[PDB]
Amino acid sequence: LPILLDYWPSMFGMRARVALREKGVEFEYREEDFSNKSPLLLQSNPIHKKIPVLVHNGKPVCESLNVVQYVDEAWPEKNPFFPSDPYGRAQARFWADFVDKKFTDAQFKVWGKKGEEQEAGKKEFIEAVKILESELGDKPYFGGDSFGYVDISLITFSSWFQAYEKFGNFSIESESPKLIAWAKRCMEKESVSKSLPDSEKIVAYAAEYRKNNL
Amino acid sequence: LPILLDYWPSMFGMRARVALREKGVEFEYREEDFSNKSPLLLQSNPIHKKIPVLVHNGKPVCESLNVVQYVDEAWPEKNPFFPSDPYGRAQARFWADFVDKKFTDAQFKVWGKKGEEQEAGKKEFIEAVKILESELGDKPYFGGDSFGYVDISLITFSSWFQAYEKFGNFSIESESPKLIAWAKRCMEKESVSKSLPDSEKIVAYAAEYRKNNL
Amino acid sequence: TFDMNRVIDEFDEMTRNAHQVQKQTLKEILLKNQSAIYLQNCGLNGNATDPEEAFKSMVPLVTDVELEPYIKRMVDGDTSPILTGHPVPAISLSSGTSQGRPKFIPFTDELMENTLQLFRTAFAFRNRDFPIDDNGKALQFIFSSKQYISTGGVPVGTATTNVYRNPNFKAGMKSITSPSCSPDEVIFSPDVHQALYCHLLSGILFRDQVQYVFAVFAHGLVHAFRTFEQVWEEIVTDIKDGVLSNRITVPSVRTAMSKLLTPNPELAETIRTKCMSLSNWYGLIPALFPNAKYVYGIMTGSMEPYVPKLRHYAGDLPLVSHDYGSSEGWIAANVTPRLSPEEATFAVIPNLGYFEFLPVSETGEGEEKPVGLTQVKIGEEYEVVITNYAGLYRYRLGDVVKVIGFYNNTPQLKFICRRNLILSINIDKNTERDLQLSVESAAKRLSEEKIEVIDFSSYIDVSTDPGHYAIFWEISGETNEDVLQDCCNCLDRAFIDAGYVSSRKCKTIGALELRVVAKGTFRKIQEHFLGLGSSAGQFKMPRCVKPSNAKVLQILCENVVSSYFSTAF
Ligand SMILES: Nc1ncnc2c1ncn2[C@@H]1O[C@H](COP(=O)(O)OP(=O)(O)OP(=O)(O)O)[C@@H](O)[C@H]1O
Ligand SMILES: N[C@@H](CCC(=O)N[C@@H](CS)C(=O)NCC(=O)O)C(=O)O
Ligand SMILES: N[C@@H](CCC(=O)N[C@@H](CS)C(=O)NCC(=O)O)C(=O)O
Ligand SMILES: CC/C=C/C[C@H]1C(=O)CC[C@@H]1CC(=O)O
Ligand SMILES: CC(C)C[C@H](N)C(=O)O
Cα separation, C550 vs B174, whole angstroms: 87
> Could you tell me which chains touch chain B, where touching means 3 or more CB pairs under 8 A?
A
Q: Which of A84, A119, A141 is the last residue of a domain?
A: A84
Residues C75, C156: Cα–Cα separation, whole Å: 8
| Residue ranges in B63-198 assigned as alpha helix (H) | 64-74, 86-98, 104-112, 116-135, 149-155, 161-168, 172-175, 177-188, 190-193
Give ∠ CA C97-C98-C102 in degrees, rounded to 5.
75
Tell me, letter by letter, the H, E, C secondary structure of B143-161: CCCCCCHHHHHHHHHHCCH
Contact between chains at A94 and B62 (C-beta distance less than 8 A): yes
Is C548 labelled a binding residue?
A: no
Contact (CB<8Å) A173/C482: yes
Ligand 2: centre distance to CA A13 (Å): 9
| Angle between helix B116-135 and B177-188 (nearest 10) | 70
Rounded to whole angstroms, the Cα distance separating B37 from A133 reads 27
Q: What is the DSSP string of C421-448?
A: ------SS-STHHHHHHHHHHHHHHHHT
DSSP state of C368: P
- The H-or-E segment that residue B204 falls in is helix B199-212
Q: State phi, psi for C466 to the nearest 5 degrees.
A: -85, 160
Residue A51 near residue A12, CB atoms below 8 Å = yes
Whose CA is closest to atom 9 on ligand 1? C327
Check residue C509 and give left, alpha or beta (phi > 0: left; psi -120 to 50: alpha).
Answer: beta
Q: H/E element holding C115?
A: helix C109-129
Q: How far apart are the first and last CA of chain C?
A: 60
Closest CA to B145 of B95, B84, B190, B99: B84
Ligand nearest to the CA of C121: 4
Beta strands in chain A (DSSP E): 3-6, 28-31, 53-56, 59-62
| Residue A81 CB-density burial (10 A; 0-12 exposed, 13-18 middle, 19+ buried) | buried
CA distance B184 to C50: 118
- Within the 140-179 window of chain A, which residues sit less than 8 Å (CB to CB) from chain B? none
Cβ neighbourhood burial of C449 (10 Å; 0-12, 13-18, 19+): buried
Q: Residue C534: which of C380, C394, C341 has the closest Cα?
A: C394
Partners of C8 in the β-ladder:
none
Question: CB pairs below 8 Å between A and C: how many?
Answer: 72
Q: Is C555 in a helix, a strand, or coil?
A: coil
Strand, helix or coil for residue A61: strand
- The CATH code of the domain that includes B75 is 3.40.30.10
HSE value, Cβ hemisphere, 13 Å, CA-based, for C333: 23
Q: Is residue B51 in contact with ligand 3, taking CB distance under 6 Å?
A: yes
User: Cβ of A87 under 8 Å from any chain B Cβ?
Assistant: yes
Closest residue by Cα to residue A60 from A10, A2, A99, A129: A2
Q: How many helices (H) and strands (E) does chain A have?
A: 10, 4
Coil/strand/helix, residue C92: coil
Ligand with smallest separation from the Cα of B16: 3
Specify the pairing of strand C467-475 against strand C453-461. Answer: antiparallel
Phi, psi dihedrals of residue A25, rounded to the nearest 5°: -95, 140
Chain C residues lying within 8 Å of A173, measured CB to CB = 482, 485-486, 489, 567-568
- Among residues A155, A153, A204, the alpha carbon closest in space to that of A181 is found at A155
Helices B104-112 and B116-135, interaxial angle, to 10°?
140
Beta pairing class for C319-321 and C294-298? parallel
Residues in contact with C425: Cβ distance below 8 Å, sequence separation at least 6, in sequence order? C99, C100
The Cβ of residue C53 has, within 10 Å, a number of other Cβ atoms equal to 8
Angstrom distance (rounded) from CA C26 to CA C41: 18
Spatial contact of C491 and C445, defined as CB atoms under 8 Å apart? no
- Name the maximum alpha-carbon separation found in chain B: 49
Strands A3-6 and A28-31: parallel
Under 8 Å between Cβ of C494 and C167? no
DSSP C448-480: TTT--EEEEEEEEE-SSSSEEEEEEEEESS---
C-alpha–C-alpha distance, residues C287 and C296, integer Å? 16
* Domain containing residue B204: CATH number: 1.20.1050.10
In this complex, is the C-beta atom of A174 within 8 Å of any C-beta atom belonging to chain C?
Answer: yes
Ligand 4 pocket check for C115: Cβ under 6 Å: yes
**Which of these, C350, C352, C378, lies nearest to C16 by C-alpha position?**
C350
Inter-residue contact C4 to C127 (CB < 8 Å): yes
Q: What are phi and psi of A43, to 5 degrees?
A: -95, -15
Instruction: Please give the Cα distance from C309 to C280 (Å, whole number).
Output: 11
- Give B29's strand partners: B4
**Is C448 in contact with A173 (Cβ distance < 8 A)?**
no
Of B27, B59, B84, the domain-final residue: B84
Distance CA C519, CA C215 (A): 13
Give, rounded to a whole angstrom, the gap between the first and last alpha carbons of chain A.
Answer: 43
Q: Which of residues 35-74 of A touch C (CB under 8 A)?
A: none
Coil, strand or helix at C391: coil
For B54, left (φ over 0), alpha (ψ -120 to 50), or beta?
beta
Domain that holds residue B50: 1-84
Q: How far is ligand 2, taken at its centre, from the CA of residue A61, in Å?
A: 15
DSSP label at residue C418: S
Torsion sign across C-alpha atoms C125, C128, C133, C139? negative
> What residues contact C364, with CB distance under 8 A and at least 6 apart?
none
In terms of domains, do B98 and B188 share one?
yes
Task: Judge if B91 and B80 occupy the same domain.
Answer: no
Q: To 5 degrees, how large is the angle CA C222–CA C227–CA C229? A: 100
A204 interfacial to chain C (CB closer than 8 Å): no
Give the integer Cα–Cα distance in Å for B202 and B158. Answer: 11
User: Mutation test of the interface with chain C: which of A141, A156, A184, choosing the one with the most C Cβ atoms within 10 A?
Assistant: A184
How far off is chain A from B188, nearest CA to CA, in Å?
30
Cα-atom radius of gyration of chain A, to the nearest Å?
17
Q: Alpha-carbon distance C354 to C90, whole Å? A: 21
Contact B70 A63 (CB under 8 A): no
Task: Write the DSSP symbol of residue A27.
Answer: -
Name the nearest CA neighbour of A156 among A21, A12, A2.
A12
| Length, in residues, of chain C | 569
Length of chain B: 214
Which atom belonging to ligand 1 lies closest to the Cα atom of C550? 21
Closest-CA distance of chain A to residue B60, Å: 9
CA C36 vs CA C25, C44, C67: distances in Å: 17, 9, 13
The response to whether residue B205 sits with its C-beta less than 6 Å from ligand 3 reads: no
Sheet-wide strand order for C319-321 = C137-140, C210-217, C294-298, C319-321
Residues 6+ apart with CB under 8 A from A134: none
Question: Which chain B residue's Cα is nearest to A75?
Answer: B86
Strands A28-31 and C137-140: unpaired
C273-C198-C457 Cα angle (round to 5)? 125
Given a contact cutoff of 8 angstroms between Cβ atoms, the answer to whether C407 and C15 are in contact is yes
Quick one: B109 and B99 in the same domain? yes
> Of A27, A84, A79, nearest to A56 (Cα)?
A27
Q: Does residue B190 share a domain with residue B125?
A: yes
Answer yes or no: do B92 and B65 share one domain. Answer: no
Positions at the binding site of A: 10, 51, 64
Q: Are C392 and C385 in contact (CB under 8 A)?
A: no
Q: Are residues A40 and A105 in the same domain?
A: no
Task: Show me where chain A is broken: residue before each gap, C-N > 2.5 A.
Answer: none
Examine the domain organization and report whether A169 and A123 are in the same domain: yes
What resolution does the deposited structure have, in angstroms? Answer: 1.7
Is A213 found in the same domain as A161?
A: yes
DSSP summary character for residue A28: E
User: Three-state secondary structure along C172-212?
Assistant: HHHCCCCCECCCHHHHCCCCHHHHHHHHHHHHHHCCCCEEE
Alpha-carbon gap: C442 to the closest alpha carbon of chain A (Å): 6
Phi and psi of B159, rounded to 5°? -75, -35
Task: Please answer yes or no on whether B73 and A86 come within 8 Å at the CB atom.
Answer: yes
Ligand 5 pocket by Cβ (under 6 Å):
C 142, 158-160, 163, 216, 524, 527-528, 531
Distance CA C467, CA C131 (A): 54
- What type of residue sits at position C415? F
Torsion sign, CA atoms C462, C464, C468, C471: negative
SS3 assignment, position A193 = coil
Distance CA C535, CA A30 (A): 54
Question: Would an 8 Å CB–CB cutoff place A93 in contact with chain B?
Answer: yes
Contacts of residue C448 in chain A, CB cutoff 8 Å? 159, 162, 196, 198-200, 202
Whole-number Å distance between alpha carbons of A86 and B149 = 16
- Indicate the number of domains in chain A: 2
Q: How many residues does chain A have?
A: 214
CA of B182 to the centre of ligand 3 (A): 26
**How far is the C-alpha of C300 from the C-alpha of C298, rounded, in Å?**
6
Q: Report yes or no: C125 and C336 within 8 Å, Cβ to Cβ.
A: yes
Atom of ligand 4 nearest to the CA of C532: 15
The dihedrals phi and psi of C471, each to the nearest 5 degrees, come to -95, 135
Centre of ligand 2 to C-alpha A35, Å, is 14
Both B80 and B101 in one domain: the answer is no
Helices (H), ranges, C181-315: 184-187, 192-205, 218-241, 251-259, 265-277, 284-288, 306-314
- Residue type present at position B176: S
The residue contributing the CA closest to ligand 4 atom 15 is: C531
User: Which phi-psi region, left, alpha or beta, contains residue C374 (left: φ > 0; alpha: ψ -120 to 50)?
Assistant: alpha
State whether B150 and B172 are in the same domain: yes
Q: How many CB atoms lie within 10 A of CB C87?
A: 14
Task: Kindly state whether residues A120 and A196 are assigned to the same domain.
Answer: yes
Nearest chain A Cα distance for residue C457, angstroms: 19
Is B131 marked within a binding site?
no
Where a domain ends, among B84, B101, B127?
A: B84
Distance CA B120, CA B110 (A): 9
List of chain A residues whose C-beta atoms are within 8 Å of the C-beta of residue B93: 66, 69
Q: Is B10 labelled a binding residue?
A: yes
Kindly tell me the burial class for residue C96, based on how many C-beta atoms sit within 10 Å of its own C-beta (0-12, 13-18, 19 or more). buried
C181 CA → ligand 5 middle, Å:
18
Return the ligand number nearest the Cα of B213.
3
**Whose Cα sits closest to atom 3 in ligand 5?**
C160
Instruction: Check whether residue A39 and residue A52 sit in a common domain.
Output: yes
Q: Which residues contact C129 (CB under 8 A, 6 or more apart)?
A: C337, C338
The CA distances from residue A109 to A125, C113, C365, in Å, are 9, 65, 70
Burial level of B47, CB count in 10 A (0-12/13-18/19+)? exposed
Closest ligand 2 atom to residue A66 Cα is 19
B158 phi/psi in degrees, rounded to 5? -65, -25
Q: Kindly compute the dihedral angle of the four CA atoms of residues B86, B91, B94, B100, in this order, to the nearest 10 degrees.
A: -120
Distance CA A182, CA A138 (A): 10
Sign of CA dihedral B20, B23, B28, B29: positive
CB neighbour class for C441 (10 Å; exposed up to 12, middle 13-18, buried from 19): buried
Cα–Cα dist B11/B9, whole Å: 7
Closest CA to A96 of A152, A18, A156: A152
CA gap C522, C209 in Å, rounded: 30
> Are residues C459 and C556 in contact, defined by beta-carbon separation less than 8 angstroms?
yes
